[PDB]
Design a protein around this ligand. Sequence first.
Ligand SMILES: Nc1nc2c(ncn2[C@@H]2O[C@H](COP(=O)(O)OP(=O)(O)NP(=O)(O)O)[C@@H](O)[C@H]2O)c(=O)[nH]1
Ligand SMILES: Nc1nc2c(ncn2[C@@H]2O[C@H](COP(=O)(O)OP(=O)(O)NP(=O)(O)O)[C@@H](O)[C@H]2O)c(=O)[nH]1
Ligand code: NI
Ligand code: NI
Ligand code: NI
Lengths: 199, 199
Amino acid sequence: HPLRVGVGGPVGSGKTALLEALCKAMRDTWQLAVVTNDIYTKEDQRILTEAGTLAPERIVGVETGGCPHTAIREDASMNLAAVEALSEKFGNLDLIFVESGGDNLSATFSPELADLTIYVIDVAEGEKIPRKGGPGITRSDFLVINKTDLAPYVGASLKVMASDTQRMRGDRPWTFTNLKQGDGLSTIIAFLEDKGMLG
Amino acid sequence: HPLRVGVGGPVGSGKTALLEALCKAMRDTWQLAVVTNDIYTKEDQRILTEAGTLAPERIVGVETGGCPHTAIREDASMNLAAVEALSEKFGNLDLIFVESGGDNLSATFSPELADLTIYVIDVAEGEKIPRKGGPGITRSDFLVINKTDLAPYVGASLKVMASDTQRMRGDRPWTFTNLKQGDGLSTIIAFLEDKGMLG
Ligand SMILES: Nc1nc2c(ncn2[C@@H]2O[C@H](COP(=O)(O)OP(=O)(O)NP(=O)(O)O)[C@@H](O)[C@H]2O)c(=O)[nH]1
Ligand SMILES: Nc1nc2c(ncn2[C@@H]2O[C@H](COP(=O)(O)OP(=O)(O)NP(=O)(O)O)[C@@H](O)[C@H]2O)c(=O)[nH]1
Ligand code: NI
Ligand code: NI
Ligand code: NI
């Protein structure tokens, strides 16, 4: 049975960009599928399918209504059914990603739905976002701080963000990324293959 | 009694920057106060106070816990009491802003708490955010699309975003802003003075 990786974070932080890059880099080694969530549309399913990240039948969209965290935590029924339909259809899957709808800082995945959690924030949301806290920043299995290339335009210091993040997470891993260039991707891939116990 | 203006939007879109700019521009004509919200911190209260947007006692922070939308919609009692205390303390306020915690695209203010709503998204969240919809984009009294200066770095077309916004909102007013520079504020001020019936 496949590892379920939940990818969460605020609106626009780079979750879909992360899935696209991970799928393109890992799909020749591992059998993958993706469940995307959005409240009102299936836009991210279309984006990932049109980008060719995986074959279309490996990418499923769920339109949740309401809060994204409800669909990944309080009532995960739809996402669990979609994961079941994929696992039964493909049989040999190693890893299924679930992209949350973008949400507020209190949102996390239920352990019933996600075996590992990646939380994605981005620098343009502000230097102080790590200090504003929440379980995505403090307790996710892996935190991604994306869009470092935008730091000079919003006036954020990456040294400050790194210090604040370390104060919030202790020994729990995190990395800066620039998903436009792919910077920081290989380390996330290594974390998934290891802590996800792939193979 | 003062006009209550709710300012909502996803994490990091520029709500506090908008409040800073509106306060600095409007405070010489109108008597203002601000209630800031966040889930785990009072950081935005500190940020506005340190920026000198208003005197310290005109800016009150509420730490909500849970989802930001609960505090501005389903159970707004804490915010309602903070708005009432500011109104009684200052006696003659024309307008009180309430900044939501950054949230998902389904978040709105109850009419009990907000007379007018401003919803703030930003270009770095993606060209496609207007199309992802929701009542903040489609039904808010005024929509702000902030951080236009970041469009070339994220690869977003403002022409496309404007076309999609017109389809989502019809004639309901909106504007692009660059709050780093102050562009676009005059439209928002004129809307508040007119539809807010100030004076
Ligand atoms: N400059 C820059 N832009 C980035 C980076 N990562 C993503 N972007 C841009 O950021 C925007 C949002 O990316 P996207 O992957 O759609 O984020 P999301 O978190 O999936 N959005 P949603 O919450 O709607 O699902 C896009 O315009 C994308 O090009 C980065 O590292 N640097
Ligand atoms: N380049 C640029 N940066 C902007 C603009 N508006 C805001 N910023 C930057 O964007 C980041 C977030 O702004 P902020 O006002 O804190 O947003 P917010 O929506 O109030 N955040 P929160 O959801 O945490 O309350 C800050 O680093 C701020 O400097 C803009 O138009 N252009
Ligand atoms: Ni996405
Ligand atoms: Ni703010
Ligand atoms: Ni919620």
